[PDB]
Design an enzyme around this catalytic site. Structure first.
Site, PDB file in Angstrom:
ATOM      1  N   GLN A 137      -0.923  44.937  25.201  1.00 34.19           N
ATOM      2  CA  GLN A 137       0.276  45.568  24.631  1.00 34.19           C
ATOM      3  C   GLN A 137       1.183  44.540  23.963  1.00 34.19           C
ATOM      4  OE1 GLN A 137       3.045  47.503  27.332  1.00 34.19           O
ATOM      5  NE2 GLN A 137       3.415  49.182  25.886  1.00 34.19           N
ATOM      6  N   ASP A 148       3.055  42.029  18.869  1.00 33.47           N
ATOM      7  CA  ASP A 148       3.217  40.880  17.984  1.00 33.47           C
ATOM      8  C   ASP A 148       2.546  41.125  16.637  1.00 33.47           C
ATOM      9  OD1 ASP A 148       2.764  38.331  16.650  1.00 33.47           O
ATOM     10  OD2 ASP A 148       3.088  37.313  18.537  1.00 33.47           O
ATOM     11  N   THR A 193       5.204  40.854  11.457  1.00 32.80           N
ATOM     12  CA  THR A 193       4.281  39.905  10.826  1.00 32.80           C
ATOM     13  C   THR A 193       2.864  39.991  11.406  1.00 32.80           C
ATOM     14  OG1 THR A 193       4.564  37.986  12.311  1.00 32.80           O
ATOM     15  CG2 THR A 193       6.206  38.291  10.604  1.00 32.80           C
ATOM     16  N   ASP A 226       2.380  34.999  16.190  1.00 37.03           N
ATOM     17  CA  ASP A 226       3.419  34.010  15.956  1.00 37.03           C
ATOM     18  C   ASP A 226       4.631  34.224  16.842  1.00 37.03           C
ATOM     19  OD1 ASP A 226       4.816  36.248  15.060  1.00 37.03           O
ATOM     20  OD2 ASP A 226       5.234  35.453  13.069  1.00 37.03           O
TER      21      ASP A 226
HETATM   22  C1  HEM Z   1       2.223  52.074  29.805  1.00 36.31           C
HETATM   23  C2  HEM Z   1       1.947  51.334  28.720  1.00 36.31           C
HETATM   24  C3  HEM Z   1       2.055  51.894  27.273  1.00 36.31           C
HETATM   25  C4  HEM Z   1       2.913  52.803  26.800  1.00 36.31           C
HETATM   26  C5  HEM Z   1       3.948  53.498  27.701  1.00 36.31           C
HETATM   27  C6  HEM Z   1       2.647  52.978  25.376  1.00 36.31           C
HETATM   28  C7  HEM Z   1       3.232  53.825  24.457  1.00 36.31           C
HETATM   29  C8  HEM Z   1       3.005  53.845  23.074  1.00 36.31           C
HETATM   30  C9  HEM Z   1       3.660  54.701  22.082  1.00 36.31           C
HETATM   31  C10 HEM Z   1       4.735  55.769  22.339  1.00 36.31           C
HETATM   32  C11 HEM Z   1       3.162  54.419  20.885  1.00 36.31           C
HETATM   33  C12 HEM Z   1       3.558  55.045  19.538  1.00 36.31           C
HETATM   34  C13 HEM Z   1       2.437  55.954  19.090  1.00 36.31           C
HETATM   35  C14 HEM Z   1       2.823  56.596  17.798  1.00 36.31           C
HETATM   36  O1  HEM Z   1       4.045  56.816  17.587  1.00 36.31           O
HETATM   37  O2  HEM Z   1       1.910  56.902  16.992  1.00 36.31           O
HETATM   38  C15 HEM Z   1       2.176  53.380  21.056  1.00 36.31           C
HETATM   39  C16 HEM Z   1       1.469  52.837  20.035  1.00 36.31           C
HETATM   40  C17 HEM Z   1       0.570  51.830  20.123  1.00 36.31           C
HETATM   41  N1  HEM Z   1       0.022  51.342  21.283  1.00 36.31           N
HETATM   42 FE1  HEM Z   1       0.790  51.736  23.165  1.00 36.31          FE
HETATM   43  N2  HEM Z   1       1.608  52.130  25.040  1.00 36.31           N
HETATM   44  C18 HEM Z   1       1.234  51.475  26.179  1.00 36.31           C
HETATM   45  C19 HEM Z   1       0.264  50.532  26.262  1.00 36.31           C
HETATM   46  C20 HEM Z   1      -0.465  50.003  25.239  1.00 36.31           C
HETATM   47  C21 HEM Z   1      -1.460  48.961  25.397  1.00 36.31           C
HETATM   48  C22 HEM Z   1      -1.821  48.301  26.753  1.00 36.31           C
HETATM   49  C23 HEM Z   1      -1.966  48.715  24.170  1.00 36.31           C
HETATM   50  C24 HEM Z   1      -3.047  47.713  23.715  1.00 36.31           C
HETATM   51  C25 HEM Z   1      -3.873  47.125  24.591  1.00 36.31           C
HETATM   52  C26 HEM Z   1      -1.288  49.584  23.244  1.00 36.31           C
HETATM   53  C27 HEM Z   1      -1.553  49.617  21.911  1.00 36.31           C
HETATM   54  C28 HEM Z   1      -0.848  50.316  20.983  1.00 36.31           C
HETATM   55  C29 HEM Z   1      -0.892  50.082  19.564  1.00 36.31           C
HETATM   56  C30 HEM Z   1      -1.731  49.077  18.768  1.00 36.31           C
HETATM   57  C31 HEM Z   1       0.047  51.112  18.973  1.00 36.31           C
HETATM   58  C32 HEM Z   1       0.406  51.307  17.477  1.00 36.31           C
HETATM   59  C33 HEM Z   1       1.548  50.331  17.193  1.00 36.31           C
HETATM   60  C34 HEM Z   1       1.843  50.378  15.722  1.00 36.31           C
HETATM   61  O3  HEM Z   1       1.129  49.673  14.944  1.00 36.31           O
HETATM   62  O4  HEM Z   1       2.776  51.143  15.342  1.00 36.31           O
HETATM   63  N3  HEM Z   1      -0.381  50.366  23.914  1.00 36.31           N
HETATM   64  N4  HEM Z   1       2.093  53.049  22.392  1.00 36.31           N
HETATM   65  N1  LIG Z   2       3.128  50.662  21.946  1.00 35.00           N
HETATM   66  C1  LIG Z   2       4.605  51.258  21.946  1.00 35.00           C
HETATM   67  C2  LIG Z   2       5.038  52.215  21.152  1.00 35.00           C
HETATM   68  C3  LIG Z   2       6.209  52.785  21.077  1.00 35.00           C
HETATM   69  C4  LIG Z   2       7.140  52.413  21.899  1.00 35.00           C
HETATM   70  C5  LIG Z   2       8.461  53.121  21.785  1.00 35.00           C
HETATM   71  O1  LIG Z   2       8.268  54.517  21.798  1.00 35.00           O
HETATM   72  N2  LIG Z   2       9.757  52.677  21.582  1.00 35.00           N
HETATM   73  C6  LIG Z   2      10.734  53.485  21.466  1.00 35.00           C
HETATM   74  C7  LIG Z   2      11.864  52.663  21.316  1.00 35.00           C
HETATM   75  N3  LIG Z   2      11.467  51.415  21.369  1.00 35.00           N
HETATM   76  C8  LIG Z   2      10.093  51.475  21.560  1.00 35.00           C
HETATM   77  C9  LIG Z   2       6.736  51.447  22.719  1.00 35.00           C
HETATM   78  C10 LIG Z   2       5.514  50.943  22.729  1.00 35.00           C
HETATM   79 CA   LIG Z   3       3.439  38.728  14.538  1.00 36.18          CA
END
Ligand code: HEM
Ligand SMILES: Nc1ccc(C(=O)n2ccnc2)cc1
Ligand SMILES: [Ca+2]
Ligand SMILES: *[C@@H]1O[C@H](CO)[C@@H](O[C@@H]2O[C@H](CO)[C@@H](O)[C@H](O)[C@H]2NC(C)=O)[C@H](O)[C@H]1NC(C)=O
Ligand SMILES: *[C@@H]1O[C@H](CO)[C@@H](O)[C@H](O)[C@H]1NC(C)=O
Ligand SMILES: *[C@@H]1O[C@H](CO)[C@@H](O)[C@H](O)[C@H]1NC(C)=O
Length: 595
Positions: free
Chosen positions: A105, A110, A184, A188
């Protein structure tokens, strides 16, 4: 061929030719093309986007409009029929710590962030999307299927707003829609420092020239730093318990407080920086604040790259590691260092690794207090449990000694996320991270599963039995063909995650291909990679090789028994050693005396 240089970018960015530090915005990394890898540009398209109308409209936007001659199934229905499960016994990963989940995560945060475009000041359609479930422009709500429990309790939809997109940030014309990467593409530490000079400085301690990151003054952790609060309101961390009145933290990345273990790891990341700027002072009291900061930042960024590349990826990628990520050969300026759009989905594999509960463990690694173990959902945007209940240390112990969830074709995403997700503007612990992931694939114009199998030099199933043989699962394959009616239509998030794990890793072939390429590209394409000659002195690079997450813990907590290998499953007190058995980050090579 249309709009070769399109965008409403971060405009007035010029470059220092021999500057020894990265920009905050990631700009000026590549010299021939200095916007490559930089925050606030389009995500890279490894393949042409596929929208309902070829331009911007998502598949599933229009009833009558089919994908390859079929209606795409509702995201929440794929969620219910495939992604859910009841029984949390037997789901734990026997050889991965919960920290394994957590680094994923971090690394991810990052690398990428594609924020929703809500973009209204005093706006009606804010609550209008949520209240009335009326699809339109950027409101793209996730609709319930017939006979779904949430119909009975929540309404007709869960709300959803389409991601930010470049150029015309309000409308759209003649090239396919492209979503923005707000951070980015380089590894980094952008999550500690920011990806905007604006944020980068609002995070610094510019009140005393020691180059420290600004800390919390309201509260302390046995004389150890907390990240400062984010005094923006409405604060969701205040919304989750109005009595404690404890806001979300302020980090280089905006998502830090989404869950307590993410917040926790951000805190270790702040302290390491401060710890480093203190040591640099002692060894170089002639240096100014800025250099102390930069040289610390430089040190932390390398730290994240080693840990990720030496420790993280081999155990995600396993057998496919070497195939996709050959040992380092040096900087190549021809590599595209941009995070790709499909990677922001591929890396969501981590979602299936999140387990149902979080523990706090005392100095004997025993259940700290009566309510030591909590369900994950009560920990979304919850800072109050850190400041008002034990600090970071008990949780950092939880990360060492408990297990990540194992991915499992019959038990994919836990209900804490699949049903009980809290989101900031909304109110209920009632959302579905799986539904969202799938709605996002479509919002982003993702090619379907077979396009990506194609892309990765793997077979492309066309029949039920074909899919059965690839997934090595009749029932899963059946439920998917029942929903999607052709693998070509299967959403990549589910498709890649459905594939059995490769020997020694934690993702299937397709994902290991996608992830593999991306990480290779971000390392090969980075003028500032720690091992790139002339980035560090060879002397500096020998002190760097000896960092560990264990050592990060020891230097930044009051934990004195740690595993040697923090990502594998470790059991106390067997696999635990005293901190002084552990290599440190010698900083002798960084002393630069006057003469
Ligand atoms: C309890 C832990 C976690 C919570 C509560 C959480 C929650 C979220 C939420 C709400 C989103 C936004 C999805 C969207 O709006 O389309 C997100 C996106 C994402 N999550 Fe998680 N997540 C968790 C753990 C992880 C982990 C462990 C990974 C990777 C190993 C991960 C990878 C990603 C990635 C790559 C995105 C898209 C970010 C972007 O490019 O906008 N998440 N996550
Ligand atoms: N992989 C993640 C995606 C979204 C959030 C997220 O919903 N917020 C909302 C406000 N700041 C983070 C956190 C982690
Ligand atoms: Ca970065
Ligand atoms: C809100 O947070 C407060 C802490 O600020 C919680 O109240 C504490 O609850 C525990 C449980 O017995 C006690 O040890 C404290 O004495 C309580 N403090 C106060 C001021 O009431 C409360 O449980 C939280 N509530 C929710 C819904 O999260
Ligand atoms: C900045 O550093 C000074 C000197 O160490 C310290 O007293 C102060 O608390 C710091 N301020 C912030 C906001 O971090
Ligand atoms: C744990 O993880 C790695 C990955 O294969 C491996 O080196 C080690 O053998 C595994 N340990 C156990 C106890 O299975």
């Amino acid at each position: 061929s249309w709009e070769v240089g399109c965008g409403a970018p971060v405009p007035l960015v010029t470059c220092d030719e021999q500057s020894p530090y990265r920009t905050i915005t990631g700009d000026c990394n590549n010299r021939r093309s200095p916007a490559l890898g930089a925050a606030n540009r389009a995500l890279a398209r490894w393949l042409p986007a596929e929208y309902e109308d070829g331009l911007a409209v998502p598949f599933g936007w229009t009833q009558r409009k089919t994908r390859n001659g079929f209606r795409v199934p509702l995201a929440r229905e794929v969620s219910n029929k495939i992604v859910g499960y009841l029984d949390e016994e037997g789901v734990l990963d026997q050889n991965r710590s919960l920290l394994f989940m957590q680094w994923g995560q971090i690394v991810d945060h990052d690398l990428d962030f594609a924020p929703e475009t809500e973009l209204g000041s005093s706006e009606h359609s804010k609550v209008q999307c949520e209240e009335y479930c009326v699809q339109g422009d950027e409101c793209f709500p996730i609709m319930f299927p017939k006979n779904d429990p949430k119909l009975k309790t929540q309404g007709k939809c869960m709300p959803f707003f389409r991601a930010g997109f470049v150029c015309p940030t309000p409308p759209y014309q003649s090239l396919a829609r492209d979503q923005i990467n707000a951070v980015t593409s380089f590894l980094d530490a952008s999550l500690v420092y920011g990806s905007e000079p604006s944020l980068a400085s609002r995070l610094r301690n510019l009140s005393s020239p020691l180059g420290l990151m600004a800390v919390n003054q309201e509260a302390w952790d046995h004389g150890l730093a907390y990240p400062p609060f984010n005094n923006v309101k409405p604060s969701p961390c205040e919304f989750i318990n109005t009595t404690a009145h404890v806001p979300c933290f302020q980090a280089g990345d905006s998502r830090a407080s989404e869950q307590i273990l993410l917040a926790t790891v951000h805190t270790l990341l702040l302290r390491e920086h401060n710890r480093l700027a203190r040591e640099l002072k002692r060894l170089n009291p002639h240096w100014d604040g800025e250099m102390l900061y930069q040289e610390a930042r430089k040190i932390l960024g390398a730290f994240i790259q080693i840990i990720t590349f030496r420790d993280y990826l081999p155990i995600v990628l396993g057998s496919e590691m070497q195939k996709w990520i050959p040992p380092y050969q040096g900087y190549n300026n021809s590599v595209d260092p941009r995070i790709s759009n499909v990677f922001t989905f591929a890396f969501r594999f981590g979602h299936m690794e999140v387990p149902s509960t979080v523990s706090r463990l005392d100095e004997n690694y025993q259940p700290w207090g009566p309510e030591a173990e909590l369900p994950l959902h009560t920990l979304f945007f919850n800072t109050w449990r850190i400041i008002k209940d034990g600090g970071i240390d008990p949780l950092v112990r939880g990360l060492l000694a408990k297990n990540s969830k194992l991915m499992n074709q019959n038990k994919m995403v836990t209900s804490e996320l699949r049903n009980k997700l809290f989101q900031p503007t909304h109110k209920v612990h009632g959302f579905d991270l799986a539904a969202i992931n799938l709605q996002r694939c479509r919002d982003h114009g993702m090619p379907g599963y077979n396009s990506w199998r194609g892309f990765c030099g793997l077979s492309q199933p066309k029949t039920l039995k074909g899919l059965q043989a690839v997934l090595k699962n009749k029932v899963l394959a059946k439920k998917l063909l029942d929903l999607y009616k052709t693998p070509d239509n299967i959403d990549i998030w589910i498709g890649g995650n459905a594939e059995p794990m490769v020997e020694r890793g934690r993702v299937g072939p397709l994902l290991a291909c996608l992830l593999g390429r991306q990480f290779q590209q971000i390392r090969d394409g980075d003028r500032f990679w720690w091992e790139n000659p002339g980035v560090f002195t060879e002397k500096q690079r020998d002190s760097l090789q000896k960092v560990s997450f264990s050592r990060l813990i020891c230097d930044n907590t009051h934990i004195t028994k740690v595993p040697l290998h923090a990502f594998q499953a470790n059991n106390y007190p067997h696999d635990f050693v005293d901190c002084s058995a552990v290599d440190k980050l010698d900083l002798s090579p960084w002393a630069s005396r006057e003469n």
